[PDB]
Symmetry: D2
Subunit: 455 residues, 4 copies
């Protein structure tokens, strides 16, 4: 069952419906790298769900009431009250987006040489942990690393790995546990409430802090409501509030589940850390009462976080992604399983099994998808993994995928059909997909500006 949109369209965004012949020329001008395409040339842009969301009429009304004062803006107090109400943390510091909050948390909470342990990781999060002297330890359950395994709550932390870390390194040498909801690297997999409570129980017995990476915590809450026994009578807001009751604080990218185009924040319960955070936020972001955001954006993020709590909104959000995954899977197209809250990942290793990884199957599949449909997707394979600059060899990741990342409230099921129909047609003659070779490769950030040609 797939629900209708629980909203209607207030205003539309103009697009170029250029045809296949012209899309091929645009793809070649981009050197077959979807990251180099111009937005104006893309029909359906599934590069990312970050910051690409459609706002409501209520949020746009809030955008006309930005109090742009440098200190003490009414919009900050609205955001503060909303986050305290819905997440339940004592203190909040706005940041311009998620990695701004990560920067502050890692400087406040890590002594060099300490460990940070988490359920897999995200690139910016782990960078700020490592930059401040932490050693990262993955404590996710082993199943999360099996991309074909169709089981619930795949993002759960293995409590035995956490106990083992505590026993081998000592609780005083662990800076914090970093629990992400959902788990992006596993394909957007949720964490169960039972897991969050067990982690809080164990860490609290040792005086260890837990901070959440909360960027898709509402998608996570929907999975708990749908699949965890005992939560069928709880509202999304009740589930969200209980989730954060098991944490000492969080970092949040509003660009994901708060339904905005920019914005984030840092939450914590400890007064002393809050005071230290306010001393640091002015260094990198702005005042404790704007944190690198215009007043109107704090307002839109306060309104959007509250909208995200509507059951029908988040049900439809997750089930629209599920629709895309279900349609591909029914045609035999290989995807990461189960489908996550925000994206479908194509398995390009299996999709293009006639290509070796050195011929960049995911990069080439993403280029084919755009030519055939006008859909942009993100390479998440060997190109994004980068090259080892000491040895000169590619980093070879186990996952060679194309990410179909779904912005919130932007597309319809008919757009999902454009994406799926086009991929299914490609799959039916997948052996015709050609390998790629570099014609320009920069030393760093190579996925952003590299250019290719066909082998």
């Amino acid at each position: 069952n797939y629900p209708a949109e629980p909203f209607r369209i207030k205003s539309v965004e103009t697009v170029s419906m250029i045809p296949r012949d012209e899309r091929l020329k645009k793809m070649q001008e981009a050197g077959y790298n979807t990251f180099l395409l111009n937005s104006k040339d893309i029909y359906i842009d599934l590069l990312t769900d970050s910051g690409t969301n459609a706002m409501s009429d209520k949020q746009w009304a809030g955008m006309m009431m930005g109090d742009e004062a440098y200190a003490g803006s009414e919009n900050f107090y609205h955001l503060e009250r909303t986050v305290q109400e819905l997440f339940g943390f004592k203190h909040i510091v706005p940041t311009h987006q998620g990695r701004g909050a990560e920067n502050l948390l890692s400087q406040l909470a890590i002594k060099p040489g300490q460990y940070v342990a988490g359920n897999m990781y995200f690139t910016t999060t782990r960078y700020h942990q490592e930059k401040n002297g932490a050693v990262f330890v993955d404590i996710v359950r082993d199943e999360a690393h099996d991309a074909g395994l169709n089981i619930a709550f795949k993002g759960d932390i293995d409590l035995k790995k956490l106990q083992k870390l505590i026993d081998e390194k000592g609780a005083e040498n662990i800076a914090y546990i970093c629990l992400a909801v959902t788990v992006n690297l596993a394909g957007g997999q949720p964490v169960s409430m039972a897991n969050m409570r067990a982690v809080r129980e164990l860490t609290a017995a040792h005086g260890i802090k837990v901070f959440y990476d909360a960027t898709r915590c509402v998608e996570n809450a929907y999975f708990i409501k749908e699949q965890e026994q005992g939560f069928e009578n709880k509202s999304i807001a009740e589930i969200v509030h209980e989730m954060f009751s098991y944490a000492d604080g969080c970092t949040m990218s509003g660009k994901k589940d708060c339904l905005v185009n920019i914005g984030g924040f840092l939450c914590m319960n400890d007064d002393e850390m809050f005071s230290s955070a306010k001393e640091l936020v002015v260094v990198y972001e702005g005042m404790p009462s704007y944190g690198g955001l215009a007043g109107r954006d704090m307002e839109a993020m306060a309104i959007g976080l509250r909208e995200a709590m509507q059951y029908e909104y988040i049900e439809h959000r997750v089930k629209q992604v599920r629709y895309l995954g279900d349609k591909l899977k029914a045609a035999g197209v290989p995807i990461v399983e189960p489908v996550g809250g925000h994206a479908v990942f194509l398995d390009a290793r299996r999709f293009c099994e006639h290509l070796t990884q050195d011929e960049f199957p995911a990069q080439s599949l993403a280029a084919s998808i755009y030519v055939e449909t006008g859909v942009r997707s993100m390479e998440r394979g060997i190109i994004s993994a980068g090259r080892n600059n000491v040895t000169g060899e590619h980093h070879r990741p186990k996952l060679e995928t194309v990410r179909l990342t779904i912005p919130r409230r932007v597309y319809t099921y008919a757009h999902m059909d454009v994406v799926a129909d086009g991929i299914i047609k490609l799959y039916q003659h997948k052996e015709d997909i050609r390998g790629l070779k570099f014609i320009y490769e920069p030393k760093q950030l190579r996925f952003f500006t590299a250019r290719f040609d066909y082998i």
Copy 2:
């Protein structure tokens, strides 16, 4: 086929359904007339495509650049030259919506006792004709009155009827021919270019003026491109411009095909009529330089009329209506055929064969649709047709219909499925729909605020 939306969602508004018990209360508080229900108590609002459209990001950018000057506004010049370019008429007078332009035309072009002949009546149009002393004569082809007959270009004028009128009444006693594109009350049926050309040739030979009702001219142009031999490779804009080349002027409700929420205009080629129209507009609407519109709305209408010329936009507009009609017809639900440009008309005579037309089956069917579905639709039958101003008896249209009217760019195919599924279920117990009788009847245009009770 059924194309996906050729645009993305930029902003949303929430929709919601109140329980059946509450809709029942609301419906009897509205005296079983859908016009009297409150917007907040509707779920999917298909009352009308008039003024309910979603604007684009470009139109909303135009809304921030309203030049609100009383005379000489940049927005007026933009609207004036956009209409001169796309429609080809010499002169434009803005009005706040279509019936303001009809008020002006009828006062300018009718001498009491004269005939106005058109391809089927419309409610406000016919009121202003008769109010100024004209007798209305219907010269549409007989087939347009047969709901079930699936033939192309049902809106066409019967040239034999036009010829007969000229012979029996004399050309000097005909004030003008009123040619509407599409024809709303026939079900949104298009008029062919061959018919517009034949009508021009016959009227010109007798010195008789032709004024178009331009309200859904872009939907009409799409049907010409899709189905009239020789037009398959003409652009929508080319077809629109050729259409109006066979007219002396037009009235336009921009609230339909100009993709806005308010706005209209009167066009003409004749200099003396334009001079007279400017004297009159001051009394009813405003100065000729804004015609009862804010500058920002002249701007949005100039932008939206040009957007409407995009083939993919109007193809999707029309085929989304066709999807709803196709799904209802596949389930056996009786509808007006072929499906028109803007709405699906349920054939209330067949839905409610247990009722005579004096029991108002269309009015009653609309009420029952809201009660069982939360979807609002409009009566288009004996209630809307009014009374004969000579005998005092009902006008008795063969077409007794309930209109599922689709606003432009607002809903998705999933919303269409919700509508179709609900109507198909009500079809299964159609015998439960009771007849209605008047408890309050306005003296004109009675359908707007009439109140009914069950017989």
Copy 3:
């Protein structure tokens, strides 16, 4: 004493600061008629205070929450509740602006041959009265016709003239009393509460209806608060509510004192007339619940009417106009006295006493003002009076004036200084102002498109 603006600027409107040499070319291209100037070529546009107001951030937030439903829009209920609260009338029908409401009132309230009596008149108001068969009778106090007489509440009705009318024509032959607040034709002069109560007392004794032309009723309320004994402790809202307690209904142009760019409405207390108005509004304007306005505009007008009740806003509005009049008067420039709520009128007969009225001194002064300052003003003299088309002679009005009409919240005191300094400099060599002659004169609406050259 002149207060600072009780607001700050949220956003600005871009203007062309073209210099004098270029302004002279624009004036010549406009044939020396300020009505023909392009808005884009004007620095400070004082043509009118109608519909040219600046909205607040709160109103623009309301503009993002337009409920564009054809019937039952939430914005209509907001407007309805606001007008019932602030004006106290039982029923309200929205219209697209003031003359839409006048059209409806005059058709509902006049039997042919009846009299309508008022404190002077406005052009559209009297047209709709006369078009429906009324004979207009001026019952303003004699002093209002003395444009140099500096006395308070110059708009007051002479109760003896009203008694005389009742005695000579009979109360059953008077359709209604039309009491305007303020009185535009006298230069924007207020009416006292004592006068409103006396008129209500007298008319009620005879069963005669009173309807207000309420377009600048808030400016009027400020004069009562400032100058009528006993109202120093009353709020603007209290004064406004008491004013309308002496009326049976009103017509309102929101384009003036409701601080919007479009919109108006009709109010009445009588159920039967309300029911008749709802039958008529659909003919000319729209549904009783939108009346020719987009939902967003009903919202902005509801918000703006409530903002207009703020004492500091309306005090500053009236005193900014007063500042301009005081500065001109201190330099000896001849103006209509006292200065009204919305405009300063220059006496061009005295300003250009070396020119005869057939040389159009007001039209020429308005052209000079634009060339010297970039300020557009309105001719209100012999050109606007029109030509008698039977005899071919000008209508020769006693008042030959240039109107400096001040939009609400758009300009600063520094703009008022630009206007005043430029006029004062012109006055110091007023004998150099040249007379004008027609080079193009249309048969009607001649002030709108006539063109001139220097004698």
Copy 4:
């Protein structure tokens, strides 16, 4: 002279004053630091010109056309090419505001132990220099530190000081010269083109890089046009482009002279530095294609930087500040002279000659201004100067000032008169202002959230 605003008001926001008793309570709740007051409790907010500007109708139209794509946004391309055209640098990296660009520059261009030399310190700039291991050296002319000395181009670097630094330290130990235009903490003082050219010539001869702080470069260009011989007939844009031709790159807070509420960027000519900057921006800000900004804000900043080039806009901006300074100086109030581009600085040393600088007269004067006036102003003296990171003692600036900072396009001359009248009255009892002592001092950038009590 004092020109009128070269724009009209398009939209407003209300302002209000709470009673003195309430401001007194608010001020001690803020611990006598103006940074801790709440926006709703301020009347006229002169805390800062940073991010408080009023945008234009064109910018707000741009805000409706935000292309929120993660890469390839039309808004990024517009900002990129606008900056390349107006500033002339080869490469641009957007950041969410200026201190994000300072974070990147300081990490890219400083090796620990090296010197950075600039024309007076700024708070966030100096923090990021020192945090990355640089020693700051002030090479502004001695006169810039003398509040009362009225000389032109007080921001100029002393070339003898620059030469001395090169001789004593060696050019290889200087990371770069930081040249700010205007110089904020000297009172908004401009730098001459002759000085920028001399600095470029001397640094280039030694291979030393020059990076500008571009934050108020348009105000600086205005002073050059107004006062530097030979530039009187150059356009603001020409002057701006020549200015940056003497630099290797710049940091920019668009929140000042780009007329926006959020936004900044880093420019450079060097290709390898640009490559490194793109790696770093990902960690702190976002992808190089949006740099921590929504698309709509890249758009507003591209539009606003071009608007700032309009001569009449920036002339009025600067002369409105000058008006406030002239009115205070005419009444004997001690100020920094000449008045700078963005603010009037009261000379707190002279206002409060009864206090030593260790009693924080500037911090105390700011509090008393809010208590007596409701006007918020900022401390710019010993509190902002921070502590010496080697000795732990106060930095002791000669300039102990209270800043009346003017947001662009927000206030009128009448608002300036309210401010001046209030300060002139407080001047009459200056002996009533008590000294302050710290009760809470942050470890860096302490002025933002420090809390004080009276001695």
